[PDB]
Design a protein around this ligand. Sequence first.
Ligand code: XUS
Lengths: 99, 99
Amino acid sequence: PQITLWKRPLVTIKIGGQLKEALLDTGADDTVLEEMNLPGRWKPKMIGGIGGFIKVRQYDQILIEICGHKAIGTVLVGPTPVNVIGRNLLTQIGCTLNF
Amino acid sequence: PQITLWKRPLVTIKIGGQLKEALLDTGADDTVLEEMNLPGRWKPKMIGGIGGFIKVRQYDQILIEICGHKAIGTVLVGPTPVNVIGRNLLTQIGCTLNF
Ligand SMILES: CCOP(=O)(COc1ccc(C[C@H](NC(=O)O[C@H]2CO[C@H]3OCC[C@H]32)[C@H](O)CN(C[C@@H](C)CC)S(=O)(=O)c2ccc(N)cc2)cc1)OCC
């Protein structure tokens, strides 16, 4: 679709068989989701943002559907203020900025 | 133009008679720029993201030229790790997400 930016660009995602709401975030290199029970192996990792660094669980090769578009890649789980879809997955669904 | 997301969506902006580089960031509600000395009255504000909050100065009705496209709105200035153009100005230049 074409998504304007008057409101937050929130979309429904499906991950680990569960539906969630997430923000399409072109300023995020990586995808970060709030604490959740996700199937798969994981490794501790640190990710930094505007306020500093947080500890996350790094899951690799996770299936995630973003408004019906399938992606398979890295998902970080940790104390983010909001679920954010970063460029690592936005590229997989063919997302571009246009103006 | 059309901006793919393989790389950081960095562009040149002009603000207060200065050229700077900034990220087109659909995840930022408001535009936040590195410490800069801007004429005018301002309001203190706190903005939060991954890792917590930072303190910024809120300037209203600031003009910014983004790849030749003019926008006028709120600009937050403070010790941000990154310059971001947020939705408050991205809407003004007609920016959409497309996939
Ligand atoms: C020099 C580098 O230092 P740094 O690595 C951190 O640098 C950064 C810091 C922030 C960004 C931009 C933010 N992306 C982000 O958090 O992405 C994470 C995950 O993917 C990684 O890629 C980059 C960082 C990692 C996001 O787009 C926008 N944000 C809100 C989101 C979270 C939704 C609420 S907001 O910034 O909080 C923000 C809040 C209110 C307003 N009005 C304006 C902005 C990009 C690089 O060190 C740590 C001190």
